[PDB]
Design a protein around this ligand. Structure first.
Ligand SMILES: [Cl-]
Ligand code: NA
Length: 129
C-alpha cells in the first residue's frame, strides 16, 4: 500500500507515535517519506547482505528475521515480511523499540540527513488528526 501523507500521519498518530520519545509526528512522516516514499512494500538490500523492509525500512541485521542474514539478530521478534503489510502496526511497534535503544531517530539515515533540523511540522500541515 502506498499511503497518502495525511493518511499515514493519522495512522501513525493512532498507533501512539506522536511525541513518542519526544519525536513529534512530523518527524515520523518525514522519515517514512524519504525511507520508503510511503510504500509499505519497499525493500532495499545493503552491502553486508542484510535487507531493509517496509515503510520505515527496518533492517534485517538487527530487527527482524528474513532467513537470509546469517549471524543477525531478531530484536523485534517478527518475520521481516510482516513489516510489508498494509497494516503498519508491526512496523510501528518495532520502530518504538528502535527509537528507544539510545540513539533516537538517528538510526534512520534518511531522517538524519533529510529531516533532522528541518521544519518537520510542515509534513503534517493541513491534515485532519
Ligand atoms: Cl532522542
Ligand atoms: Na535478522
Amino acid at each position: 500500500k502506498v499511503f497518502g501523507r495525511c493518511e499515514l500521519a493519522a495512522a501513525m498518530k493512532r498507533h501512539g507515535l506522536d511525541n513518542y520519545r519526544g519525536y513529534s509526528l512530523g518527524n515520523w512522516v518525514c522519515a517514512a517519506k524519504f525511507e520508503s516514499n510511503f510504500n509499505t512494500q519497499a525493500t532495499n538490500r545493503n552491502t553486508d547482505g542484510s535487507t531493509d523492509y517496509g515503510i520505515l525500512q527496518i533492517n534485517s541485521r538487527w530487527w527482524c528475521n528474513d532467513g537470509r542474514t546469517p549471524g543477525s539478530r531478531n530484536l523485534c521478534n517478527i518475520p521481516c515480511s510482516a513489516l510489508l503489510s498494509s497494516d503498519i502496526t508491526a512496523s510501528v511497534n518495532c520502530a518504538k523499540k528502535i527509537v528507544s535503544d539510545g540513539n533516537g531517530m538517528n538510526a534512520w539515515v534518511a531522517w538524519r540527513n533529510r529531516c533532522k533540523g528541518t521544519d518537520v511540522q510542515a509534513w503534517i500541515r493541513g491534515c485532519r488528526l
